[PDB]
Design a protein around this ligand. Structure first.
Ligand SMILES: COc1cnc2c(NCc3nnc4ccc(-c5cc(C)ns5)nn34)ccnc2c1
Length: 286
């Protein structure tokens, strides 16, 4: 039930634009197209093709008013490199997202079917940087930027995803349980200070982006395979970084090193990353 009175009065008008009427959505529950900890995702028809995420695997949703607020905030986000929210359908509520034909970025670059060039791979990086530039300008911290968490549409447009109501753990292997807090953390993508404090910032998103660039240039290799979970802090503090992939241009590796600056405030902004990477991208043919 929608309690319009419970919402921030500023946001009441926006409800009509986020709520999908049950008769407008057909969801094809017979084939799962994605699996998250909080729920499965299915093909949907809205006639536009969409992805429908269930949240029924969680014991409880929480405050319905908060859920709508989350949806309303997320729907106002509009950028070609950021996954949009189509709306919410109240059957546990269903999250309705544009269908991303080529799935997550990590699986796409690991796929022997497609053959992206070095230029294509850098371009995927550039698109992610533009999405993050948008998100950072909205003061939004992603917290879980990784190749597994970005997706590609039918025209290979890369979109930063896995945020707002779409937030989940879509690949359980890369999340470790913290001793004191219990939080499940993507430790191999996290900035040194975040591992120490569990505080996430746009500058820790920049660190994660550096790892994402490394993923692209290795075509989806796992980072730090010979490191075990939380021993990553010890490993990094020894004076170590991910090595330069064979086909990674030198200036792109320099960008990665800047993203992993020990001082958070010294890391490049996403705007600077867009500029620097667009330059490097332009030097390639094909
Ligand atoms: C082509 O198959 C799919 C699968 N899942 C989604 C999908 N799932 C919800 C979602 N929102 N953000 C993210 C980010 C990552 C992922 C996934 C990652 C993995 C490994 N499987 S799904 N899903 N996801 C949304 C849109 N299109 C899809 C297309």
């Amino acid at each position: 039930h929608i309690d319009l009175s419970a919402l921030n009065p500023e946001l009441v008008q926006a409800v009509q634009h986020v709520v999908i009427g049950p008769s407008s959505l057909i969801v094809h529950f017979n084939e799962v197209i994605g699996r998250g900890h909080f729920g499965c995702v299915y093909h949907g028809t809205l006639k536009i093709h969409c992805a429908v995420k269930s949240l029924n695997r969680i014991t409880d949703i929480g405050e319905v008013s908060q859920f709508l607020t989350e949806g309303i905030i997320m729907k106002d986000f509009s950028h070609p490199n950021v996954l949009s929210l189509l709306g919410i359908c109240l059957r546990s509520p269903l999250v309705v997202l544009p269908y991303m034909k080529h799935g997550d970025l990590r699986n796409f670059i690991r796929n022997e079917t497609h053959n992206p060039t070095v230029k294509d791979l850098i371009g995927f990086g550039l698109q992610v940087a533009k999405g993050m530039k948008y998100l950072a300008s909205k003061k939004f911290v992603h917290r879980d930027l990784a190749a597994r968490n970005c997706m590609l549409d039918e025209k290979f447009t890369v979109k930063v995803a896995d945020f707002g109501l779409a937030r989940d753990m879509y690949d359980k292997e890369y999340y470790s349980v913290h001793n004191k807090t219990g939080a499940k953390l993507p430790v191999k993508w996290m900035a040194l200070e975040s591992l120490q404090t569990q505080k996430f910032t746009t500058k820790s998103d920049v660190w994660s982006f550096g790892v994402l660039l490394w993923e692209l240039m290795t075509r989806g290799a796992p980072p730090y395979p010979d490191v075990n979970t939380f021993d990553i802090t010890v490993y990094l503090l020894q004076g170590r970084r991910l090595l330069q992939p064979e086909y990674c241009p030198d200036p792109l590796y320099e960008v990665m090193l800047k993203c992993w600056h020990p001082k958070a405030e010294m890391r490049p902004s996403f705007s600077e990353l867009v500029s620097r990477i667009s330059a490097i991208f332009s030097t390639f043919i094909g």
